[PDB]
Structure 1
Amino acid sequence: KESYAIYVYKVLKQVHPDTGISSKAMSIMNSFVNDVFERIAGEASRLAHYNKRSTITSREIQTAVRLLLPGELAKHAVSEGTKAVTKYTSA
């Protein structure tokens, strides 16, 4: 129920609208999405606790993703996050 398949469909149409997806693949994407989410969140939490912080911010996640993620994917994703939050905050 609390699932991303509609968002998967959005980005699927946004990335390869010529491709359908099996419900199996869609579920795998949902499992994948949940896995990466809990991975980054669990890390950022434990980093915040290590920093004695009761709050999580962009820096914590920006640090955590650079920890989790391969070097290119990291700086690309980091730039995407900073761009996005810049647009969000500038709005």
Structure 2
Amino acid sequence: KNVETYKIYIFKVLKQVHPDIGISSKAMGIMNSFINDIFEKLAQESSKLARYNKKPTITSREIQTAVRLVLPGELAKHAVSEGTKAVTKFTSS
């Protein structure tokens, strides 16, 4: 069966950041595992937030709060800014 991964999108991001630098297969697998871990942490935090506030729907507010709780400091600030920009662009389209 087909195993879904993030390799294509990680490669697109790498080409955006470093057009002439490639990535090995081991490093790509490590990056995929890291992305999976971050997504799992965000999903767990969002589910906990939804349970605490008795709100069954997970929205961008839950994701923002989970990012603030999980990511540290300036990294969390920049991630929140990027997410807000992406949501605004998505809604404006």
What TM-score comes out, normalization by structure 2 length? 0.95
The residue aligned with 2:12 is 10
Number of paired residues?
A: 91
Identity %: 78
Structure 1 unmatched ranges of 5 or more: none
Return the offset for 1:40.
Answer: 0.6
The residue aligned with 1:53 is 55
How far apart in 2 are the matches of 1:76 and 1:15? Answer: 17
- Over the aligned positions, Cα root-mean-square deviation in angstroms equals 0.7
Q: Which runs of 4+ in 1 moved over 3 A?
A: none
How far apart in 1 are the matches of 2:45 and 2:62? Answer: 9
Return the offset for 1:18.
Answer: 1.4
For residues 11-50 of structure 1, the aligned pairs below 5 Å read 11-50=13-52
Structure 2 unmatched ranges of 5 or more: none
Q: Deviations over 1:31-89 (max 9, x none)?
A: 00100000011111011001111110110110110011111011111011011100000
How far apart in 1 are the matches of 2:61 and 2:44? Answer: 15
